[PDB]
């Protein structure tokens, strides 16, 4: 994919200066996909989650705007993907050839995310623009407001990495674990607090029971 997206409440004059920073050093892959190394868990992930879906970012913003206790504005950041951005599936496949097992809840979450992970911090050079998101209290919809183009952006001819994440820890023994989610089955790593900042801290539910319901009866 060429371009991916994140939502943040930090305004463009700050993000275009600093970029996005990793929570920590935790390379564990299934802890990242399940949200356990993200903001609702150990909050030390060595990855930044991005999505290729613009519609998902509308859902992220609605989940924040819909809360009575949330104040402030939200921006969608458009990010050029390069060789440090990985899709999930090749690493899913590779880790399975190491004896790793992902249950149906985790596989379900991963394919819904349309997720590309950055193994490094995301530089302002990769951030092309910011689009303010406007919330309509009467409809609950989120629309595009003012766009701001990043003068520091570099239009390099890169694209996302089609291979496996490097230095992946060898998979741990399988265990059923909570999967943090918010909104319509959005991984918690897409929350604003799942990148390190210079912020409203969304709460998450366990996606497993919800997924179990739509898979059964």
């Amino acid at each position: 994919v060429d371009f991916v997206y994140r939502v943040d409440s930090t305004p463009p004059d700050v993000i275009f200066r600093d970029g996005f920073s990793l929570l920590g050093y935790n390379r564990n892959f299934q802890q990242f996909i399940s949200g356990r190394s993200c903001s609702g868990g150990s909050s030390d992930s060595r990855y930044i989650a991005t999505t290729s879906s613009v519609n998902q970012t509308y859902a992220i913003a609605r989940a924040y705007y819909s809360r009575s206790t949330f104040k402030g504005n939200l921006y969608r950041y458009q990010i050029r993907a390069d060789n440090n951005f990985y899709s999930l599936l090749p690493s899913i496949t590779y880790l399975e050839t190491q004896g790793g097992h992902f249950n149906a809840y985790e596989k379900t979450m991963m394919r819904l995310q349309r997720e590309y992970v950055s193994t490094l911090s995301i530089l302002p050079e990769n951030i092309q623009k910011a689009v303010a998101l406007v919330y309509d209290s009467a409809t609950g919809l989120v629309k595009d407001g003012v766009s701001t183009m990043n003068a520091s952006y570099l239009g390099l001819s890169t694209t996302s990495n089609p291979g496996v994440i490097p230095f992946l820890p060898e998979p741990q023994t399988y265990t059923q674990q909570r999967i943090d989610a918010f909104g319509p089955l959005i991984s918690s790593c897409f929350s604003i607090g799942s990148v390190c900042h210079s912020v409203y801290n969304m709460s998450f539910y366990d996606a497993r029971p919800v997924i179990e319901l739509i898979l059964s009866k």
Binding site: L22, L120, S121, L123
Partner: peptide
């Protein structure tokens, strides 16, 4: 970024 690496 520098913070992405364990340096020593």
């Amino acid at each position: 970024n520098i913070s992405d690496y364990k340096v020593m």
